[PDB]
Design a protein around this ligand. Sequence first.
Ligand SMILES: [K+]
Ligand SMILES: [K+]
Ligand SMILES: [K+]
Ligand SMILES: [Mg+2]
Ligand SMILES: [Mg+2]
Ligand SMILES: [Mg+2]
Ligand SMILES: [Mg+2]
Ligand SMILES: [Mg+2]
Ligand SMILES: [Mg+2]
Ligand SMILES: [Mg+2]
Ligand SMILES: [Mg+2]
Ligand SMILES: [Mg+2]
Ligand SMILES: [Mg+2]
Ligand SMILES: [Mg+2]
Ligand SMILES: [Mg+2]
Ligand SMILES: [Mg+2]
Ligand SMILES: [Mg+2]
Lengths: 136, 177, 51, 84
Amino acid sequence: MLQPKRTKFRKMHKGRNRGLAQGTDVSFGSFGLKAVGRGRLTARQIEAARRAMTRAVKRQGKIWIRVFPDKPITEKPLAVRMGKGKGNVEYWVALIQPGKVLYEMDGVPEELAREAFKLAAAKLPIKTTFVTKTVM
Amino acid sequence: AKLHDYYKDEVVKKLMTEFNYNSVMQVPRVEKITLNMGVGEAIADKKLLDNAAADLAAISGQKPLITKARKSVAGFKIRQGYPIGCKVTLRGERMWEFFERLITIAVPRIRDFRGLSAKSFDGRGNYSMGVREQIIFPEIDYDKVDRVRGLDITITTTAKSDEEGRALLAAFDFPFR
Amino acid sequence: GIREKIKLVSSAGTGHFYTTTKNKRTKPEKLELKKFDPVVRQHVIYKEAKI
Amino acid sequence: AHKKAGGSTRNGRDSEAKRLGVKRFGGESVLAGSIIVRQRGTKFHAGANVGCGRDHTLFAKADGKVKFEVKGPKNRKFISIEAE
RNA sequence: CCGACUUACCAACCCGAUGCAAACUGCGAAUACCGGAGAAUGUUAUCACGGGAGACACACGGCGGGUGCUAACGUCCGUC
RNA sequence: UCCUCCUAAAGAGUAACGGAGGAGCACGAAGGUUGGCUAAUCCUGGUCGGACAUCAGGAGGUUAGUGCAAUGGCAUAAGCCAGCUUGACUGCGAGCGUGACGGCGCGAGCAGGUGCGAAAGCAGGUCAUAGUGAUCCGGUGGUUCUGAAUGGAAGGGCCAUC
Ligand SMILES: [K+]
Ligand SMILES: [K+]
Ligand SMILES: [K+]
Ligand SMILES: [Mg+2]
Ligand SMILES: [Mg+2]
Ligand SMILES: [Mg+2]
Ligand SMILES: [Mg+2]
Ligand SMILES: [Mg+2]
Ligand SMILES: [Mg+2]
Ligand SMILES: [Mg+2]
Ligand SMILES: [Mg+2]
Ligand SMILES: [Mg+2]
Ligand SMILES: [Mg+2]
Ligand SMILES: [Mg+2]
Ligand SMILES: [Mg+2]
Ligand SMILES: [Mg+2]
Ligand SMILES: [Mg+2]
């Protein structure tokens, strides 16, 4: 499951998720799944969607995961009050903005690529759309 | 110096005809000769560094510069500023005199001497060679040596490449293998 | 720390003195310096003494 | 259930803010001795009629107007005073 | 001794392409702030000194944020 | 209690049992000045010598160094080396910065007397920012002050310091 092998700091501010994505274009495969909504992808969600599409293509072709979950999310345990310092790190997320290409694929028919991405999108919280590599 | 005149009157002119250099200034020249003893055991007994320094003095005829550790290395238990070796750099007349002694009397005394390796060049016409034991130099009295110790010779030249550097040395009958 | 206070007393007949800190262990020999003495208005030798 | 004790933070320290930065801006008239910049290191350099203190404070050595300028090969920022 | 083949694997540096950063910057606004000149408007709206205070439990709403679960009619800051 | 960074919204300031690290010193040289010098790392060739010691050359160009955290600085170097020294001086100080205040900080220039330099000049500690504690009380030295009738003295003041 995706995590940075090491990080300079352990905990991070919440921040905000304004703006539109860089990486709007298919760059390695011929087909891809593009984010249309906005939100967080957790490492678990990314992995679940990955497993879904590879099963659909029976491991044929190649798959690129374009997003990486590098942001640590903390939570406090149950029955604890406010204060007493920042909670412990629980899981890692990637911040998604509209337009980001999440996955790419090639080496399979388009009519199979659509089916594979349909199965994967069902695992992701954000809405997504199928896109193809343009000339230029 | 004797070999210096041999350079001026023969080596330079034959090299000119060999490589077809356009200017006499283009012909390679010997710039310096440097002797190094990496004593090392000066980490134990400083008299060893002194005794090694006396040997370079006798061989070279000038007081050696003792060389300090560039940086600490735990792999050898050396701290920075510890004496590790000593060097002598020879230039001008005393360079040619040593160079003459080395060829004419010193290297003949090497055990099982078959000639020096012709490939011991750094890639830019500087030749470097080790000697295993000090006794090749008659200035060291065999009856009085404390310990075996070798040294490195390095010859620095204005040559641009090993082919030019090798030609320069061979012109002195520098005994390549 | 081992850095300990001392005073330097004017070698002139004046009472004037400076105070300073000295590492007693590593430098056991007495500190001695020329310094201005404003009572005689001259540079004069000063010598270490007990605070 | 039982109310459960929290832990403790290991952080919790900071130093007093030092009020660094530019104290007189371009075109501003100053008297001799006036401090122009409080710095850490020479983020600005002393130009004409400007001094540099032991803590790299730049100060006016003449009356005039403050001029900021970029000079030299390193494109370093110099402060100077122009006589009025 | 030196060492050859091969890989069900991993593979730094360098090179080409693609992303992320409160504690990264070879870039870099809008605003805000400091100084100067000018017109109009404003019951001197400014500053100094002196007499009398009260207050030092704040609340919500917008915008920028830390904490929390981008939970709270939660909590702690900035500005209106 | 003190220092450095973020939070902190491109002037200053800005809270939380918010996120991260340090100090409670060292140095008569690690200070002053004059003269000189320039790093890490890696690749080649060399006695013992090895992944790593000293030596020569090349690439590289500050990725090193800074007495100790972090930030900002530093080639004119503030980094490294050597000679001579005690300015780690005494009395002051135009004018500013920062604090509610007590306070803290920067500083050209005057007077005296010094050190380095041929000289111009530089020096009132250390690349800067932490290394600290009011008043009372008491001790030590000095002094052109005071001295309970008078001459002293005690005690007090003033100056240096504990
Ligand atoms: K009033
Ligand atoms: K800030
Ligand atoms: K010196
Ligand atoms: Mg109950
Ligand atoms: Mg601060
Ligand atoms: Mg109150
Ligand atoms: Mg209340
Ligand atoms: Mg209150
Ligand atoms: Mg409030
Ligand atoms: Mg509330
Ligand atoms: Mg909030
Ligand atoms: Mg600010
Ligand atoms: Mg602002
Ligand atoms: Mg110099
Ligand atoms: Mg730095
Ligand atoms: Mg320092
Ligand atoms: Mg009396």
